[PDB]
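Sequence design from tokenized structure. All designs in this work follow the same two-part layout: the structure record, then the generated sequence. An example of the structure record is given first.
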């Protein structure tokens, strides 16, 4: 968003100064890639991954170049991320980035594999290698130890989000009663209970606490069924790249560091945008497009994650954007008044754009929302 270039160079320098001598060799077959990569990497010390890397596919091919590193991180990235291994699964369907599968527990060694994946993604970052990862912004928030907001919820469970929203800005009734600081959970035949805090199953939710309740229910919704997995992943990543080295980045910057910056096709974007209470002839829309045309590609990318929840576009361009209902094109809807700030609903690839009075005001308001979002 701003001094991102500086933060990036700073990270690069940090990795360079921490580089370790000698090297590590990785011998894997083009179709046993996942399993052998796992065995070899886990048999090495985590700091060994900070040494030079020599990946020799014993599909016993070419001669030389970190093009194989790039291919490896690319390939393995799709294998580890492939839901066929039961570690990760897909989000809002038939879409694409991914989520830690609560049922990974089937594999009794899933935690060993999550540690491996964490080491591998930290390794990619340490060597400035890009991966086709599908991690969500909130997962990145977790990596950075940034508290999840109720907005983050909106992009994961619209139903859960709607109930917590009501509980928030609204006093308990005509729809509300007794709720406690516990959750009476999922997957297992027991009919049991989980406390959100010490003795929580006995603490009634009131019109004074409810704010902590909301906080605790949000975090629980994100890590439910995946706490162990998440911890295993972060511990592995941390041994290779200390999470502290990332403290200056926000979740949107972290995503870009892993997938890489890409150019946005403005014509594809414009012809595949839909509108609500706005038209291509609305002055606000004419200004919106003039604004996207004028700014940096980095601003464009931040705007995409603000609205869609990611900087990555599916194969096929904007015409293929998906929601949790199937087709969900980029949408701009008019709301509130010119004094409001723009807002978004990533689950719907929707931007709420107040009817501003001038280009300058639109520009100023969008930029603030795009960068200052937190």
């Amino acid at each position: 968003h701003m001094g991102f270039r500086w933060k990036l160079a700073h990270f690069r320098y940090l990795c360079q100064s921490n580089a370790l001598p000698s090297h590590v060799k990785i011998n894997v077959s083009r179709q046993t890639l996942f399993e052998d990569s796992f065995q070899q990497i886990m048999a090495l010390k985590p700091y060994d991954l900070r040494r030079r890397l020599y990946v020799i596919f014993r599909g016993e091919e070419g001669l030389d170049y970190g093009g194989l590193a790039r291919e490896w991180f690319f390939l393995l990235s799709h294998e580890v991320l492939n839901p066929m291994y039961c570690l990760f699964e897909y989000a809002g369907k038939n879409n694409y980035c991914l989520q830690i599968n609560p049922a990974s527990t089937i594999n009794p060694d899933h935690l060993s594999y999550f540690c491996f994946i964490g080491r591998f993604i930290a390794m990619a970052l340490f060597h400035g290698k890009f991966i086709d990862t599908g991690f969500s912004l909130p997962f990145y928030k977790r990596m950075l130890s940034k508290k999840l907001t109720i907005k983050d919820l909106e992009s994961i469970d619209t139903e859960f989000y709607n109930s917590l929203i009501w509980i928030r800005d609204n006093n308990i009734e005509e729809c509300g009663l007794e709720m406690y600081f516990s959750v009476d959970m999922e997957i297992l035949g027991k009919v049991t209970s989980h406390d959100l805090k010490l003795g929580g199953s006995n603490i009634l939710v009131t019109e004074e606490n409810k704010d902590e309740y909301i906080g605790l229910m949000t975090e629980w919704r994100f890590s439910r069924g995946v706490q162990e997995q998440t911890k295993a992943f972060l511990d592995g990543f941390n041994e290779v790249v200390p999470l502290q080295w990332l403290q200056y980045f926000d979740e949107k910057e972290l995503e870009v560091m892993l997938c890489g910056m890409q150019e946005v096709d403005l014509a594809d974007w414009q012809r595949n945008t839909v509108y609500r209470h706005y038209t291509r002839n609305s002055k606000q829309i004419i200004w919106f497009w003039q604004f996207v045309k004028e700014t940096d590609n980095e601003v464009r990318m931040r705007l995409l994650q603000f609205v869609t929840g990611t900087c990555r576009l599916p194969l096929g361009g904007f015409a293929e954007l998906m929601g949790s209902n199937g087709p969900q094109k980029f949408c701009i809807e008019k709301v509130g008044k010119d004094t409001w700030l723009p807002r978004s609903h990533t689950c719907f690839n929707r931007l709420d754009l107040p009817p501003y009075k001038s280009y300058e005001q639109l520009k100023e308001k969008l930029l603030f929302a795009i960068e200052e979002t937190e």
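The longest strand covers residues 23-28. We note this feature because it recurs in several other targets discussed in the main text.
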